[PDB]
């Protein structure tokens, strides 16, 4: 819900033509201190039946069910967050859970088992900093797919884009105003978008930042006020 600022940030960088410079200095835009705490490490699109399951990099798991409710299991193996359609959020546990979440918890379990045995953890080899604690963990607000990508919007404002063909990824964060690019070799770097405007960047990243703008634009216009039917 910091989508508007992100759009403003992406528009800025794209309008500066970061790849159309005398000398491109992408390396000077790196800022390793801006690495995100959270991103999506795994996902399963079972949207024909039940919903979209995903794992965050801290090993927590979530499901955005088809009825637009969300269930989150923390990495403590016991803590649950349930987020209703309206955004209300309940916090609870697996040991003392309402009988009413039995179906949904069982489904989360099924998603969890599928993803431990067959999916890879994106960004598995990165060492987290002490805390990584906070804040209540993000949940999946919305997601969509294109021919080229899956688009994942988290409740802390981050927008993640996974490109299908080459396995490259963007993690965009609007508060830090930064973007993390995971390349074909799975290497990660974080850039300040404002320094990319300043020093430019390679065509590989620039094209992807242009695609990110159009995708972020699609998110804002989804069920927006101009057209609640989209």
């Amino acid at each position: 819900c910091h989508l508007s600022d992100l759009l403003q940030q992406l528009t800025s960088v794209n309008a500066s033509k970061p790849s159309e410079r005398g000398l491109v200095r992408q390396e000077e835009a790196e800022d390793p201190a801006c690495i995100p705490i959270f991103w999506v490490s795994k996902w399963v699109d079972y949207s024909d039946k039940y919903g979209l399951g995903y794992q965050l990099c801290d090993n927590s798991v979530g499901v955005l069910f088809n009825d637009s409710t969300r269930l989150i299991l923390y990495n403590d193996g016991d803590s649950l967050q349930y987020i209703e359609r309206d955004g209300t959020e309940s916090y609870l546990t697996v040991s003392s859970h309402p009988n009413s979440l039995m179906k949904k918890i069982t489904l989360l379990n099924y998603f969890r088992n599928y993803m431990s045995e067959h999916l890879l953890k994106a960004g598995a080899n990165i060492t987290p900093r002490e805390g990584d604690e906070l804040a209540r963990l993000p949940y999946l607000r919305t997601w969509f797919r294109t021919r080229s990508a899956i688009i994942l919007h988290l409740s802390n404002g981050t927008v993640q884009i996974n490109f299908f063909q080459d396995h490259t990824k963007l993690i965009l964060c609007p508060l830090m105003a930064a973007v993390t690019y995971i390349n074909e070799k799975r290497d990660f770097q974080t850039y300040r978008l404002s320094l990319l405007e300043e020093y430019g960047c390679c065509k590989e990243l620039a094209s992807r930042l242009r695609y990110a703008r159009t995708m972020v634009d699609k998110l804002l216009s989804s069920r927006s006020a101009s057209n609640r039917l989209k």
Partner: peptide, 11 residues
């Protein structure tokens, strides 16, 4: 395309 990248971290 319907699941993410396959093969074999960390619960």
């Amino acid at each position: 395309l319907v699941t993410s990248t396959i093969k074999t971290d960390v619960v």
